[PDB]
Amino acid sequence: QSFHLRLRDDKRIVFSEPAVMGIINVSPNSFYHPHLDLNSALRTAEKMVDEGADILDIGGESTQIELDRLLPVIDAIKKRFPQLISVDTSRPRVMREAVNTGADMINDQRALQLDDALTTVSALKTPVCLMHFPSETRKPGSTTHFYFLQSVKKELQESIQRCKKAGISEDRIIIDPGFGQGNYGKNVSENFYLLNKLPEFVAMGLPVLSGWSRKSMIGDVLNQPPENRLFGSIAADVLAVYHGASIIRTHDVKATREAIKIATYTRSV
Amino acid sequence: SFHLRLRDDKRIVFSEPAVMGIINVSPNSFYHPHLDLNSALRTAEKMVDEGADILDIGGEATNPFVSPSTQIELDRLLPVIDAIKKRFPQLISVDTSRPRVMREAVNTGADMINDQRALQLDDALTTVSALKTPVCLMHFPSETRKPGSTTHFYFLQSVKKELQESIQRCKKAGISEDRIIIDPGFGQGNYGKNVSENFYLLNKLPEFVAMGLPVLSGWSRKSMIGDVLNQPPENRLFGSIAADVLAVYHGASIIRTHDVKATREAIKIATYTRSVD
Amino acid sequence: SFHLRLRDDKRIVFSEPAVMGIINVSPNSFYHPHLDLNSALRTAEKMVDEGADILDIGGEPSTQIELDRLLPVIDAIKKRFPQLISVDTSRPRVMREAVNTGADMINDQRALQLDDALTTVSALKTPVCLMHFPSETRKPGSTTHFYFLQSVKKELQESIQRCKKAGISEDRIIIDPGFGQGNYGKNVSENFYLLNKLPEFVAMGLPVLSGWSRKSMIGDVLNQPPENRLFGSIAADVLAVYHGASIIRTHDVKATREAIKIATYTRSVD
Amino acid sequence: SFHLRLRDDKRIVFSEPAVMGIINVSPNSFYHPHLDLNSALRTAEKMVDEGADILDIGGEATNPFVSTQIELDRLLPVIDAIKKRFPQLISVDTSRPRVMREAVNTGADMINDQRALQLDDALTTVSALKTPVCLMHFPSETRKPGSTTHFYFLQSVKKELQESIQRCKKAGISEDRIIIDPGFGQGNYGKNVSENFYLLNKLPEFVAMGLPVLSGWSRKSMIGDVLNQPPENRLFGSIAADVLAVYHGASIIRTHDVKATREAIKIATYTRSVD
Ligand SMILES: Nc1nc(O)c2nc(CNc3ccc(C(=O)O)cc3)cnc2n1
Ligand SMILES: Nc1nc(O)c2nc(CNc3ccc(C(=O)O)cc3)cnc2n1
């Protein structure tokens, strides 16, 4: 699985194999490895760069505090490292300033639903990741697995179409089924069903991004706290790439990179 | 047997329990949401071929107790009702709690109204009385009740009392007895019952049947079956059939189901067994 | 029969509905303001002799004023009497200081809506009464009774869920429909409807508290001033207990206690 | 009237036979498995309301007719939640020394061992923990039921229990911390129906050993066999066995049915002591 994106300067970047996107959360309230200051975030960035990350995803999600956290990190990373920078936000103002500070792409868990977001991404000309997120509160397990998958695909296609209409280029759109529980509105079996059926998303023609890293589904199946979820998480990434995923979002860059290389070879014989 | 008197005074006689097939047309609906008109019609066609007596169409977007949503509900319902009215002979039921949806659905061809909230919303009683259609009154779904907070016996008594009051509310409003159907409201979640309470109501269904009106029961694919079998909704067919069988064995008049043919065949055996008394 | 768990983890069981006597220590308080410490203690003494299970003390710069009225009373009561003490307040700081002084539980008419209230009660580990308080923009009578009731239950459920999420133990939550007119945003018939439907609150699975004592809906129905509302008030207490209420908040301890004893017996004989 | 000494050296006195309610948190149990913390707590609340003196929490699946971490994950949360809520004594039904330590550390007041501290380290663990312990008679090996006379079987049971008691005293376990139990049951409890009834009829012989005696017939197969009833229908027969056990001097009754048992044994106690 190879793919490309067109950056905001119309420069084409080609990935010869699935990309690894390392996570740097600067929100003290994150479930895993919150970064409370700039120095600690930069220590993580350096490790991830050493471990071979392709992209670093910086998130800190009330707008000014988000900016005070994100901007210093993006600036420092842009200054020090050659990695592509993704900003994980749903706020148009954050997108604008993040990109002005050096972010190359926008990762939106809300798929540009927040007013002004769509036009903002079109105006910035950056690649964007559209993650599937419930219209509103969904009851997990309330439909068959098949019909749930149908709705996720349908809604992602609608998001893609909104992007194209707003003038976002086809080579700037990444999609993500939005793996997780809690407000991601899925139970464990639904998450695994979407993973099993990932080729149906891949067949939509855009690069697919997948993030299982240390999440509750692994915790539930293994009965392990987040710190003990490494091996289970690696397994999900392997399966995601085996099924055609283009980008893996992870807290564990080296382990993911090595594991998915095996998935790629298995898939590519 | 039982009959329903339609708004034009024609009496539909049912010599055996009726099977009401379900077509949910809201995105947040249970089991199988129909996301467009064509998909809704494919299901109707299947259910018609499987021998449905009634097709129950519902597309509620939001709870009216908590307009744009009214119009959204209409936009989803009317095209399906209209297409079915033109194509098929089946009776059409509209599952809604909104008086305006009731009026427009009936004008479009709906024969009866199915209200989970028992016409409690402002103007619902008067609306149904004026429409002169049969109506199903369900045990009101209490989102705040803590299941198990009373004993099975007392909970059963409270369900019976509430249904008796809903019947009286209807009669006082000028809704005729031959257009009233009652339903103990099987389900968990917002239906304010746990697994054991649901099974207790099912075992005690004859107590609802003795109230003298046709009783409707809907277990199809619901969480009670999932919890007992440890299965997702697509794997609850055989458990659901069993509940329909027992409901009919105990005297239920109408079964509301996602699986028409299977329900129809199974309850025929329940009906025969019940009949040999 | 119900129970609560105090902040020391001690299980308190009530073999029958508890009577909570009211001691208001603010000058603008309802029915009988206690203008000094001595008067408050005389009332406490009477209510203890009359069989009160709990004493609810309430006195709502202004925080400090509330404390100077409350603490001396709570302190005196804590030293002299074995009854449980409740503090009627919405202010986190008053909650902390009152509990530190001897209050066993917190009674919040605002259901811990005031910032820091939730975290404060969770840390204090005391039981808390959550009363429903309709939006102050509400106009009584502008919705049907049934509709209004659903919104009251829904909002109480949301308050309960906030408490649980904040780590407040289920055996430390009491709920209250918030009987009253005026700023309680209800009219006479809405109050009687909630009373008639009280078993629907009991069905939420937590002890229910009710307070009709001397209130305006009795005054309006009987055309009586506060002094003449005793017989109507106990009638409301009787009905509340008959419908399953666990705690009755009253200015008239002896009369309420005796009346609800009859209600409890009648309810109990299934 | 009997007494026990808790590990805090405080003596607890029972003026009448104590009722021990059963809370099993294992998925595979023949009667009322508790599969989650909440169900276990509901049962506990009900049993406390009904007047239970002791709650016996077990995480080992009990089917007589057919990992340490898994037992702890089921038990500890329940024991913790009970310790924080109720004044009742907490018993932990386990044979695993590690479980004994962790359960006691979490709040268990005594240890109920169906193996009478046979597993290595169990003896020394209980002596060091300083908690009361119930020693239940269990087949040293696979016994064939009905293979000896009733009298000779009883002799072996009494001899083996006496050996167990002696092992405990030698290990330094206090005499006011030892409870004994004839181990009523079939299957791997190594007895048939007649043998169980013989032991019950002869309960006074265990009572004469000078330690409080615990007895557990609740909804067991002996009742099922005699009445031809599934577990749900064994209440009345179970009550009868409890009545006889108490009439013969049992100090503790282990039951799934607290209120019914308490009421029945009050009658037994009245009759026994009217003298
Ligand atoms: N594109 C994209 N894709 C994701 O998967 C993602 N996940 C998070 C993290 N959000 C969650 C959700 C659920 C859970 C749990 O159940 O454990 C954990 C973390 C943040 N940004 C994200 N962005
Ligand atoms: N007359 C009537 N009778 C019903 O039984 C019914 N059920 C639904 C569907 N509602 C539910 C409720 C609970 C559950 C669960 O626990 O799984 C599922 C679906 C919609 N209209 C209904 N109408």
Ligand SMILES: Nc1nc(O)c2nc(CNc3ccc(C(=O)O)cc3)cnc2n1
């Ligand atoms: N938990 C609880 N429950 C109450 O019922 C209550 N009432 C008051 C007193 N408030 C009112 C409200 C209305 C009226 C009237 O209309 O007469 C009188 C007094 C103060 N704290 C209270 N706390």
Ligand SMILES: Nc1nc(O)c2nc(CNc3ccc(C(=O)O)cc3)cnc2n1
């Ligand atoms: N002290 C003590 N005393 C018991 O009697 C006991 N029983 C069990 C449960 N074990 C059984 C054995 C046999 C049977 C049957 O034949 O039905 C049923 C249950 C677990 N802990 C126990 N602990």
Ligand SMILES: [Cl-]
């Ligand atoms: Cl449905």
Ligand SMILES: [Cl-]
């Ligand atoms: Cl007052």
Ligand code: NA
């Ligand atoms: Na791939």
Ligand code: NA
């Ligand atoms: Na409805």
Ligand code: NA
């Ligand atoms: Na009519």
